[PDB]
Swiss-Prot record:
Coiled coil: none
Pfam families: RWD, UPF0029
Transmembrane segments: none
Cross-link (Glycyl lysine isopeptide (Lys-Gly) (interchain with G-Cter in ubiquitin)), chain numbering: 187
Record-stated family: Belongs to the IMPACT family.
Keyword entries, A-Z: Actin-binding, Cytoplasm, Isopeptide bond, Nucleus, Repressor, Stress response, Translation regulation, Ubl conjugation
Comment field (misc): Present with 3030 molecules/cell in log phase SD medium.
Subunit note: Interacts (via N-terminus) with GCN1 (via C-terminus); this interaction reduces the GCN1-GCN20 complex formation and prevents the interaction of GCN1 with GCN2 protein kinase and GCN2 activation in amino acid-starved cells. Interacts (via C-terminus) with ACT1; this interaction occurs in a GCN1-independent manner. Interacts with RPL39; this interaction occurs in a GCN1-independent manner. Associates (via middle region) with ribosomes; this association occurs in a GCN1-independent manner and persists under amino acid starvation conditions.
Protein name (database record): Protein IMPACT homolog
Molecular function as annotated in GO: actin monomer binding; protein kinase inhibitor activity; ribosome binding
Domain called RWD: residue spans: 10-114
Amino acid sequence: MDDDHEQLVEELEAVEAIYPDLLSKKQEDGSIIVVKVPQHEYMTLQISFPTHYPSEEAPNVIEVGVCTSLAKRDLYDTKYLQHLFQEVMDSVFHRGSVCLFDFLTELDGVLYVEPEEETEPVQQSDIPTDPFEGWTASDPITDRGSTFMAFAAHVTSEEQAFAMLDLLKTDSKMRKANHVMSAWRIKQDGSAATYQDSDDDGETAAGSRMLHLITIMDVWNVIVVVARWFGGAHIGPDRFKHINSTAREAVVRAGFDS
């Protein structure tokens, strides 16, 4: 009856993460929800969360709905499925799991609709979302068809900057992009050992521009690499805007707004 809301709200964000479109919450923060059969059926299950939620006991199945015709409407009804649904919760009534995960297993077997026995996720992504060594990169952006991304990294003298970037630059994963550009700058905060020069790689017209760009942006002792990728139409709605907020934190953090 304490952080029960936090763990509850946590599973809400988890089921959300795993299956957004599939789940539909009637209430704001859990309380009552309507999830649909884990596969993608048509039978939606209405479930409430009592003060005796998973921790105390488990959720409350209040109703089920199903899109059917006269073909198999004689096999199972709403109140009927509710009965077996409840007996399923009985499983997720005493588990370390909250409900959503352990209750789907019973239905996964008993409800049939088993195509194959191999799961196949999607690890293929152009936009980099995984951290890098000595690198802080997280500014992918999206434009019509084109993906604009950048990698930032705080550095010491030019040797480190040159190597880490030399490597990333000659790396075939970064060569996957149509054309890549890079900018380096070393300016001793109080000393005089400074090194300046401009990269080009692809579009040389972009190099000095990018250099002056970082200069006017009030930033030094940090490197940035920009790459142009080709995805779909807009790749994704949440791609640019959402990751922008994220990217903003990264770019700034690495030392670009400092």
